Ligand binder design. Structure first.
Ligand SMILES: Nc1ncnc2c1ncn2[C@@H]1O[C@H](COP(=O)(O)OP(=O)(O)O)[C@@H](O)[C@H]1O
Ligand SMILES: Nc1ncnc2c1ncn2[C@@H]1O[C@H](COP(=O)(O)OP(=O)(O)O)[C@@H](O)[C@H]1O
Ligand code: BEF
Ligand code: BEF
Ligand SMILES: [Mg+2]
Ligand SMILES: [Mg+2]
Ligand SMILES: [Zn+2]
Ligand SMILES: [Zn+2]
Ligand SMILES: [Zn+2]
Lengths: 343, 370, 334, 249, 364, 176
DNA sequence: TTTTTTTCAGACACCACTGC
RNA sequence: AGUGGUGUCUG
């Protein structure tokens, strides 16, 4: 199939419409805008009737097959849509997706929306049979190092003037929150029809919504950015994240750091990285962290992490978020006191 | 002796006017002023510890609202409405045992019938008791009718922990916090009750009962009933001291002194004497620990001592002035460790005995001879 | 369910109690794992539920005993932790208690057997009260436990306790030699690692855990001279972590014993490693390491869902920290 | 399978007889009560009479029917599930019903098939003491006439605890109901009676079930005072009695 | 002729009436005066340790409350109500296993039926046992009905852990604290039981059982039944001492002496000998604690050594002359911590060995 | 807004009482309005500063922060008064110790990095800053250790009240 | 490239499908 | 209303 970013989708849609469109990724906003563009282009070429379905173990597949095979009294040119579940094309769903891949026709246009597909796990069969004459659209959230240029492009295409300061403020409050970021730009356009956004204008009309995953917290710890890591920790506290997930995500990299710092006396860090199968972008930040106050924080932090783990897993009142703040501050070149470490 | 007087002080002495409450004055004053001025808020919450007049004051307010006369802060008794409320089974005072109506379907059933006019009184006073038991959906269901209910419906909430309520509701309803009761109020209430029950009582008995009630008057009334049952319908120092399982402060202070003044033989003698009286050994340790803490508090400030133990006040002062704080801390820590290790001691008697012997051996100003 | 010889006398002392009708309904067995408490309870149940018992054994002919052999008996209730969970919930206890209200299906007694009372939840143990206290007529209860003091006080209050004594050390060594053929000191150390219980030592020999013990011994032969205790993680982190932590603590105890010139140590077949432990490590450090290893083993065993890797990593790093001079050592407390 | 070679009691009973016997007592059982001996129906055998007794501590129902065959006095408690499913399978009154009760299990041969159940270990209470021993007030009415009046009163009844106050005056009966909404229902009925004015507040569902169990035309109620129980039965027989213990509200 | 069979010493010998209760004279006289004077509460909470009588006292109170004679301090038998109550048949006594009916649906449908009149008795007694296992919402459901129950309802709560109850639940009850039974009175009850049951015995086994029951009579009866099974129906000193681990010899003094001199090889050799003897490690440690306690006693006041141990008297006096009190206190604390942490050790012998390793190397 | 509402309601109000009510509102205007109606209740149609402050103190539950402020300042009478307040409110004592522990831990984390103050504690920001900037980390370490030890030994005390009082007495006696 | 969580017990809340 | 499932939140 044609693998495509949202940038050229319009162009591809102007070239022609394929049998099936697969909108995949973890970003609600990018998927939604891609689906809207696809539906508008389809309606331009006569696809008037729409449908929606949620791919679920309790869905009625017979209705989908009936509407795909049969035609309607009006608006014969029809389109169909399916929301894939959180996990993806379950093993009980691949066969019926294959049937749909057989039950299609040039009259119908299929839209597939859901999270990213683990291609290493799921491939061929359904995937290749669509790949015959289909389009894959990858709509994933831009990361922190990439978000500012995305926001600049969005401001340019919405006819706004964003300076670097407003851009970084917007990139600060809204991460993993591209939907609310676009809504914030829309609200700022509504607030001032001038279209010129400065620092105070965006600063006043913005909330610290954000959305982080424990990987962001662990990366912030490895870079040793105190404010960034603490902001991430507060955000996962407010979001309601399970602290034990944070514990495991930090523990994996912390034990890797302990192993690397212990073995670095006999082997350069490059061969250790190769031994443990760690990737290059990970390699850079882990090399930055390994020579940043090591051999003391790597056992003191393991001690504090064990304290948090046992306290979390014995009682039911939790109250481990402050201890996680202690960890966030220990691994960022801000030494703590033995009083809180030992307990 | 007497007839079937089973009606216990706990319930027979439930206050029936705002003049019969033992002094939740921050609540009573506000209710009286609002009811006089007519600023009758549509929903509010009596929150406090156990047995300090939340339910009782709620009933008194229902009486004040539903009296036949004009809306008054002092309910009457000749009125039919207040008579029904006092006797229970009133048409409009709908007591809601919230711990039995936690579900949201029960709350919805409650909210459907809200708009119906009151039958005989002027308010359909919903009295939701133990509100903290309502589920989250029940609370959110109550939210809208708590914002503005019909002009005749009043919500009277009552709970022990106001922090388990969602804070939206804490916004919707007024908050009155009923604090615990000082020893003097509890003892005066017990005095009055036993005067009206024709039961001879002694001073020290009532002082000990009020001390062991722990700031709540329902515990005091249950303890008074238990003491009356322990005696022959009479309240006395012996009966209350045997019931509470404590010691007169003189014996405990004598043992504490024998520990401090290195009179180990006196320690042994008083231990044997307390063994004769059949008093729990952990009780002995707890009483010595309490006296040591009181000495430390006196060392902080003279106003630490309460009037309840005034009999030993002088000695307290002396032992506070004789012993510098480090020795008091050492004794308190030694006795605390002894009490903590008492369950694993071979015998409780010899556990306390070895705790005392350790407090005597590690004595800084007069250690046991080596 | 294999019959061990040392159950043969004790069985009598119990079965005779159930022959005259004088038997306490709730019999709590205190026995080390592998000592044979399960086989004893099973044999007692077969004796009790047989419609026509002969002497002191199961007849092997009646409907009750043939149903027990078939694994299906409505009057035979068992309380075992759910597969994949090391816990006996309150639901199973409550279900069995409600089923006890009905009469016995086969007209005989009702026998309830709890596989291990130590795994009982607090709620499950409490739900078993007032049913151990006053069970319906012709109801016989049974329980097993490694250490009775770990149970609820009220739970063992209403139970007649029978203690299965581990056999004499010479006889246990003889039984192990009859079962498997290895060096005498190997069997001796395996026995006294297992608190004198030949069943646990035999299970240790049959499984691969003895090879893992040897792996820990080699990793210690490297770790002690160089102060490199972190390496032991590869030899410690496993599903069987408590056993290896117990072995480590027992090695440390043997080193401390040799420091005081104790006549007999536990790891009798590993003299070189215990000699290295004694020579290199100061007795105060040895005591601190032993205490922390035992505490970590207890934490790993008790709190459920704990991460073995974090616990063992912290333990090893703390030991390495303790070896350095100028640091304080832990003080046991109340 | 059948190891219960010996049986305590045996019946060759018509299906309709036991159908009435259970139907006249089933509604008074206890469902998942803490008193495990009350979560069932007591079959009691004395002389040529078999009785079903069911109570939950708030209402008692006893129904007796002759058999003709002399049987030893015996008592048994059949649990709720067993008796309910036996009632369900008790159809086709043409075929007789065999009953075989042992000391631990019960068997019912219905038509050609066999049903098996276990017993409740507890001992059922004595229902003779629950029955009032000195009924001084006796009143009579029509079964349908009384029942329809109770239903009309129950229309405006407390939905939580369906309770009515029954007043008895000279040749007059009064049924008053109210709900938390003060909606009052009042029904007055003409009865034959001789005694003193008395009020008694009791549940409505229990009385309505009692009346539905007695598919008769004349009903006699026996009452002692405002606090004790009420014994309801039909005036055409004494084989079925019911005890409604009132509310103190 | 037992009802079906001999139903254990503990179940048969429950107090059938008043004046059969062992000890507990506080609650016994308080309940008697409440019954006689008309001062009857609706909620009695019998809280105390195991096997000192909390269900038995509550059942006796239920018998007395609704006996056919009247509201009597001493219930009879013979008549219907108190005959049914002891047989587990009486309808008006509702016995709740709060450890099994922890759910709130159960508490709520229990409170549903409270309004109905009692079947035959005066009071519809609700005896909730093991109350502390009720869920939080269950306690809060019971709140407003324990506060104001109908005139015919009595609540009898029984708890081993009164602290676990909400303060509100404790506030609405008479919290009768069931004191444990001291050695003499539990011994007297055991003597009376064994005499009435015609079982020969010896006094020394009696006080061994009395002092090893930890002040609980149910444990005394359990140990008595265990000794009966062990001793073939005779409660003898030898059978109890073999069953219940006791240190008849002076090895508890020998090991203490070797541990005082900080002698390691001797201490370990004696521990190994004790293990060969099949000693009870808990018993060994409690004997050590008592021995150090008496050492401290004779250090404070001479001639305080009990005449019982006059045989070894001089030795301890020698220790009183030699070892300063601080070291004896340290040894006592170490052995007590070993007692506390003995269950939580990989082995009992290993726990004792760790304790004596901590206790052996203070000074050198 | 409270000022305007009271001025248009012809309700006599003191300027400081309005600020007290607003601070007690925690940012919600309806909380301020309900507290205002209650303050008029506690009195006779007038919002007096003394009555409003007394009502707020009656409703106050911020005991642990005040206890830490007074204990660090070494104000024994204020500490004992605050313990009396926490007793009269029927406040759990172990919960009080846990709250004080959390406050001290947060103060230390703020001292390490200003970003440790999240948006969960916007009501008590300033005080926290005041305590973090002015108190050396050694004293915070000592107080945290003292309160941890006290909470460890709280169950074995004459009662929870005396245990908490003695732990705070030790913390005061440190005077570091 | 992916990489992310212990637990036993209990309390609600909503939504089939049944059964009248 | 009975039964079974999903899911979320409290210790
Ligand atoms: N302020 C008070 N004045 C007099 N008696 C009181 C007071 N507070 C509690 N009591 C006693 O406690 C009993 C029950 O009080 P209650 O008002 O139910 O407390 P709660 O707030 O916990 O429901 C009353 O009958 C009364 O004897
Ligand atoms: N006070 C007592 N007087 C006489 N026997 C007692 C007493 N306390 C306990 N027992 C004995 O203990 C057995 C169990 O008593 P029980 O009342 O069930 O204790 P619990 O409070 O722990 O439920 C009784 O059968 C009786 O033999
Ligand atoms: F309503 Be209170 F807590 F007894
Ligand atoms: F009910 Be007891 F505490 F065994
Ligand atoms: Mg109340
Ligand atoms: Mg009991
Ligand atoms: Zn009035
Ligand atoms: Zn057989
Ligand atoms: Zn009688």
């Amino acid at each position: 199939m044609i693998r495509l970013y949202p940038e050229q989708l319009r162009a591809q849609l102007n070239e022609g419409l394929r049998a099936a469109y697969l909108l995949l990724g973890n970003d609600p906003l990018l998927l939604q805008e891609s689906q809207d563009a696809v539906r508008q282009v389809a309606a331009a070429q006569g696809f008037e009737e729409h449908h929606t379905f949620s791919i679920d173990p309790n869905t009625d597949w017979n209705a989908i097959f009936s509407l795909c095979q049969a035609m309607s009294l009006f608006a014969s040119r029809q389109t169909l849509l399916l929301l894939l579940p959180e996990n993806g094309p379950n093993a009980a769903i691949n066969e019926q997706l294959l049937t749909l891949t057989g039950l299609l026709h040039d009259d119908l246009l299929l839209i597939v929306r859901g999270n990213k597909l683990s291609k290493a796990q799921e491939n061929a069969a359904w995937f290749t049979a669509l790949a015959n004459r289909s389009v894959q659209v990858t709509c994933q959230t831009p990361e922190q190092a990439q978000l500012p240029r995305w926001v600049a492009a969005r401001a340019k295409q919405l006819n706004l003037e964003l300076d670097d300061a407003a851009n970084q403020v917007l990139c600060y409050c809204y991460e993993g929150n591209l939907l609310a970021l676009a809504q914030a730009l829309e609200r700022l356009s509504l607030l001032w029809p001038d279209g010129k956004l400065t620092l105070p204008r965006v600063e006043q009309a913005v909330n610290d919504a954000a959305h982080f995953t424990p990987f962001h917290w662990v990366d912030a710890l490895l870079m040793g950015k105190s404010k960034r890591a603490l902001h991430i920790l507060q955000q996962l506290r407010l979001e309601g994240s399970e602290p034990v997930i944070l514990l495991r995500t930090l523990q994996r990299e912390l034990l890797l750091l302990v192993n690397l710092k212990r073995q670095s006396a006999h082997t350069p860090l490059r061969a250790l990285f190769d031994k443990h199968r760690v990737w290059q972008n990970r390699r850079g930040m882990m090399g930055e962290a390994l020579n940043r106050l090591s051999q003391t924080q790597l056992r003191q932090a393991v001690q504090l992490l064990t304290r948090t783990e046992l306290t979390l897993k014995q009682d039911y009142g939790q109250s481990v978020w402050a201890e996680l703040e202690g960890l966030s501050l220990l691994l960022c070149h801000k030494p703590l006191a033995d009083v809180f470490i030992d307990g | 002796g007497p007839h079937m007087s089973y009606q216990v002080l706990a319930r027979k002495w439930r206050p029936q006017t705002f003049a019969d409450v033992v002094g939740q004055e921050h609540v009573l004053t506000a209710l009286a002023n609002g009811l006089s001025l007519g600023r009758i808020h549509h929903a509010y919450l009596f929150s406090g510890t156990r047995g300090v007049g939340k339910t009782s004051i709620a009933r008194l307010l229902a009486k004040g609202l539903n009296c036949e006369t004009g809306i008054t802060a002092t309910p009457c008794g000749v009125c039919d409405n207040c008579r029904e409320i006092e006797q229970g089974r009133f048409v409009d005072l709908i007591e809601i045992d919230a711990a039995s109506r936690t579900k949201v379907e029960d709350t919805r059933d409650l909210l459907d019938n809200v708009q119906y006019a009151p039958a005989r009184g002027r308010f359909k006073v919903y009295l939701i008791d133990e509100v903290h038991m309502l589920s989250r959906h029940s609370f959110n269901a109550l939210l809208k009718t708590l914002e503005e209910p019909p002009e005749h419906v009043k919500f009277l909430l009552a709970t022990t922990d106001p922090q388990k309520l969602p804070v939206t509701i804490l916004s919707r309803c007024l908050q009155f916090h009923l604090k615990a009761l000082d020893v003097e109020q509890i003892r005066h209430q017990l005095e009055h009750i036993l005067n009206e029950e024709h039961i001879a009582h002694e001073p020290r008995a009532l002082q000990l009962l009020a001390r062991a009630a722990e700031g709540s008057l329902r515990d005091a009334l249950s303890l008074t009933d238990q003491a009356i049952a322990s005696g022959d319908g009479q309240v006395s120092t012996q009966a209350v001291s045997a019931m509470l399982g404590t010691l007169d402060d003189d014996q405990a202070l004598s043992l504490v002194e024998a520990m401090v003044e290195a009179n180990g033989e006196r320690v042994m003698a008083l231990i044997n004497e307390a063994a004769a009286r059949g008093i729990e050994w952990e009780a002995l340790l707890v009483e010595m620990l309490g006296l040591l803490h009181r000495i430390a508090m006196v060392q902080l400030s003279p106003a630490a001592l309460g009037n309840d133990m005034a009999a030993i006040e002088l000695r307290m002062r002396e032992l506070a002035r004789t012993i510098p704080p480090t020795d008091i801390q050492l004794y308190y820590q030694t006795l605390l460790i002894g009490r903590k290790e008492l369950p694993y001691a071979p015998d409780r008697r010899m556990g306390v005995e070895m705790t005392l012997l350790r407090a005597l051996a590690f004595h800084p100003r007069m250690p046991l001879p080596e | 369910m294999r019959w061990y010889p040392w159950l043969r006398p004790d069985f009598e002392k119990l079965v005779a109690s159930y022959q005259a009708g004088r038997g306490h309904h709730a019999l709590l067995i205190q026995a080390l794992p592998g000592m044979g408490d399960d086989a004893l309870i099973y044999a007692l149940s077969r004796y009790l539920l047989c419609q026509q018992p002969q002497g002191h054994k199961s007849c092997g002919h009646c409907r009750g005993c043939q149903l027990m052999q078939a694994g299906t008996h409505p009057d035979y209730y068992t309380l075992a932790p759910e597969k994949g969970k090391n816990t006996l919930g309150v639901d199973a206890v409550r279900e069995v208690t409600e089923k006890l209200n009905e009469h016995a299906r086969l007209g005989g007694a009702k026998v309830v057997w709890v596989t291990d009372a130590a795994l009982l939840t607090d709620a499950a143990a409490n739900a078993l009260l007032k049913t151990l206290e006053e069970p319906p007529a012709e109801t016989w209860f049974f329980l097993a436990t490694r250490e009775p003091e770990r149970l609820l006080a009220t739970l063992r209050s209403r139970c007649r306790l029978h203690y299965l004594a581990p056999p004499p050390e010479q006889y246990a060594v003889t039984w192990l030699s009859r079962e498997v053929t290895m060096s005498q000191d190997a069997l001796l150390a395996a026995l006294r690692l297992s608190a004198g219980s030949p069943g646990a030592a035999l299970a240790l020999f049959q499984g691969d855990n003895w090879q893992a013990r040897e792996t820990l011994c080699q990793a210690l032969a490297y770790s002690v001279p160089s102060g490199d205790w972190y390496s032991l993680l590869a030899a410690l982190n496993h599903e069987q972590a408590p056993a290896r932590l117990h072995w480590l603590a027992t090695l440390l105890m043997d080193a401390l014993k040799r420091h005081h010139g104790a006549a007999q140590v536990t790891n009798v077949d590993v003299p070189g490693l215990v000699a290295e432990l004694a020579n290199h490590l100061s007795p105060s450090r040895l005591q601190a390491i032993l205490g922390d290893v035992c505490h970590i083993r207890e934490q790993l065993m008790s709190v459920t869902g704990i991460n073995r890797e974090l616990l063992i990593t912290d333990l090893l790093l703390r030991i390495e920290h303790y070896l350095q001079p100028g640091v304080v050592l832990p003080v046991p407390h109340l | 399978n059948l190891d219960d070679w010996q049986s305590e009691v045996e019946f060759t009973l018509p299906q309709a007889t036991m159908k009435r016997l259970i139907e006249a007592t089933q509604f008074s059982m206890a469902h998942q009560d803490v008193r495990y001996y009350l979560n069932g129906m007591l079959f009691e055998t004395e002389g040529e009479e078999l009785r079903t007794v069911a109570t939950d501590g708030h209402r008692l129902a006893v129904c007796s029917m002759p058999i003709g065959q002399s049987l030893p006095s015996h008592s048994v408690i059949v649990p709720r599930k067993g008796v309910i499913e036996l009632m369900r399978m008790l159809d086709g009154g043409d075929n007789p019903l065999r009953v075989q009760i042992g000391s631990n299990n019960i068997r019912a041969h219905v038509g050609d098939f066999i049903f098996t159940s276990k017993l409740v270990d507890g001992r059922f209470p004595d229902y003779r003491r629950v029955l009032p021993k000195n009924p001084d007030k006796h009143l009579e009415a029509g079964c349908d006439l009384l029942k329809q009046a109770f239903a009309r009163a129950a229309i405006l009844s407390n939905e939580k605890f369906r309770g009515v106050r029954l007043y008895v005056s000279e040749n007059q009966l009064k049924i008053t109901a109210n709900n938390p909404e003060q909606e009052e229902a009042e029904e007055i009925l003409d009865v034959t009676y001789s005694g003193a004015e008395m009020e008694i507040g009791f549940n409505v569902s229990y009385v309505l079930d009692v009346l539905n169990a007695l598919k008769c035309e004349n009903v006699r109620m026996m009452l002692t005072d405002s606090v004790s129980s009420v014994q309801i039965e039909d005036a055409a027989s004494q084989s079925a009695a019911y005890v409604v213990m009132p509310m103190r509200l």
